[PDB]
């Protein structure tokens, strides 16, 4: 298990003097969804490129924490599911528009359901069971990235989580609990005058997985005094 965030102070949506659209748009409707595909190229050793087909791209570059992963997954029919940016995203092809991502790859064959587990989410503004709801995958081991995107693409779309200017909420995180192992992510931007999408999303780059069932979700919030 990874220890809670009080010795790991969070970010504050106000001590970010950038803009909040640079965040809400990563957890807005658009994303990289794809089923059963094999990397067709590789630019950097920790990368794979997928040709797959809304509006500004088509070839996806997936980035991992390791030189491995790229291996493993290079040439496997997989699913790809994560956030994705274009701003700070270049890469060459060898296959005589471009989007980028991190992690988000699970193996397709032998991971499907019928049958589509719903994971419940408990939201805690201030510290109070102030909302809930479920998200739904259709697969055995799911990427936390994938999970987190969902939980987010709800909150935003109903409880203003992300605005453009700053945030309603001071801090906020998303905890993931399996049986003997829990862990969290910080929903809040890097402190300063402007915010790095690639830096941020680079948290996933490890490709962390849960398991459709054994997993609950807890989203903790606070407000700006």
């Amino acid at each position: 298990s990874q220890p809670d965030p009080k010795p790991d102070e969070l970010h504050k949506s106000s001590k970010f003097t950038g803009l909040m659209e640079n965040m809400k748009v990563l957890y807005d409707d658009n994303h990289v969804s794809a089923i059963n595909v094999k990397s067709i190229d590789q630019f950097l050793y920790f990368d794979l490129i997928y040709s797959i087909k809304l509006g500004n791209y088509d070839n996806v570059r997936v980035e991992f924490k390791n030189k491995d992963l790229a291996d493993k997954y290079k040439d496997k029919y997989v699913d790809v599911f994560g956030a994705n940016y274009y701003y700070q995203c270049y890469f060459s092809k060898k296959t005589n528009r471009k989007t980028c991502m991190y992690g988000g790859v699970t193996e397709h064959n032998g991971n499907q359901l019928d049958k589509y587990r719903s994971i419940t989410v408990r939201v805690f503004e201030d510290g109070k069971n102030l909302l809930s709801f479920d998200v739904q995958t259709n697969k055995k081991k799911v990427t936390a990235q994938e999970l987190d995107y969902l939980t987010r693409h709800y909150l935003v779309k109903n409880k203003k989580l992300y605005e453009f200017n700053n945030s309603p909420y001071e801090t906020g995180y998303i905890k993931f609990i399996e049986n003997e192992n829990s862990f969290w992510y910080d929903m809040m931007p890097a402190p300063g005058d402007k915010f790095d999408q690639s830096k941020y999303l680079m948290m996933y780059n490890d490709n962390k997985m849960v398991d459709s069932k054994d997993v609950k979700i807890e989203v903790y919030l606070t407000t700006k005094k």
Partner: antibody, heavy 121, light 109 residues
Framework: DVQLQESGPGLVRPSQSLSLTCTVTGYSLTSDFAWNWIRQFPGNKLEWMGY???????NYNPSLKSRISITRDTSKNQFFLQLNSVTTEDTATYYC??????????????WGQGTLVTVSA | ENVLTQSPAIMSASPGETVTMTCRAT???????LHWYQQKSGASPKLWIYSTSNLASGVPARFSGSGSGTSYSLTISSVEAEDAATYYC?????????FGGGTKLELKR
């Protein structure tokens, strides 16, 4: 400690294959790192061939993907290289090396003695 | 793919002289993924600097490495005769992984 032993037929005929062995010692082929074939030509230029990795996974110099095989016998703990349709431009010294890494930093720590291969009729 | 380019091929030096070889990449690496190997003739290469500046096991700190972007250098302060060798920079990251074509180092007499 981790040594690396090349071997193979000193001479291949144009168009044959070229199976080579690296025999590892002091370290298990399956605990970590990549295991690479690199060959150096006359005039010394060094070309990477590719590596069988720590979990039996490959990645090849695309300049050869098609004629290139890197496989392993974990039970004799050694790795191998197969080279197709060799042409004389394949005469070279062959090293097999395992890597080390800090962070995103991968390099080649240990190298084998080498192993000349004349490709000739 | 991302060819790495070494200047000069050969370079003489009298023992005590301090000298510098270069490594010009196309593309352009971060300093971390930029290694040098040393090869004394009749022998395998061997790591010398990794991540550009960082000496390997038992290499005399006469050796140093600066570089960045697409320009990188390898320096030997007082140059002993046991320094005669060929030196290869090497980039990771790129795929395919690349070597530059030696700088040979010979002694003056």
């Amino acid at each position: 400690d981790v040594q690396l032993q090349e071997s193979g037929p000193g001479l291949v005929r144009p168009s044959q294959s070229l199976s080579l062995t690296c025999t590892v010692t002091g370290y298990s082929l399956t605990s970590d790192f990549a295991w690479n074939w690199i060959r150096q030509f006359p005039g010394n230029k060094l070309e990477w061939m590719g590596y069988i990795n720590y979990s039996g996974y490959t990645n090849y110099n695309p300049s050869l993907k098609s004629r290139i095989s890197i496989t392993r016998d974990t039970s004799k703990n050694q790795f191998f290289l197969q080279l197709n349709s060799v042409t004389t431009e394949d005469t070279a010294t062959y090293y097999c090396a395992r890597e080390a890494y800090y962070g995103r930093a991968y390099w080649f720590a240990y190298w084998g003695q080498g192993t000349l291969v004349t490709v000739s009729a | 793919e991302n060819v790495l380019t070494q200047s000069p091929a050969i370079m003489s030096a009298s023992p005590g002289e301090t000298v510098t070889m270069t490594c010009r990449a196309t593309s352009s690496v971060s300093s971390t993924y930029l290694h040098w190997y040393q090869q004394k003739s009749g022998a395998s290469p061997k790591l010398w600097i990794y991540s550009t500046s960082n000496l390997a096991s038992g290499v005399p700190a006469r050796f140093s490495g600066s570089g960045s972007g697409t320009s990188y250098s390898l320096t030997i302060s007082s140059v002993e005769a046991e320094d005669a060798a060929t030196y290869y920079c090497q980039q990771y990251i790129n795929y395919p992984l690349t070597f530059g074509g030696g700088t040979k180092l010979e002694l003056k007499r």
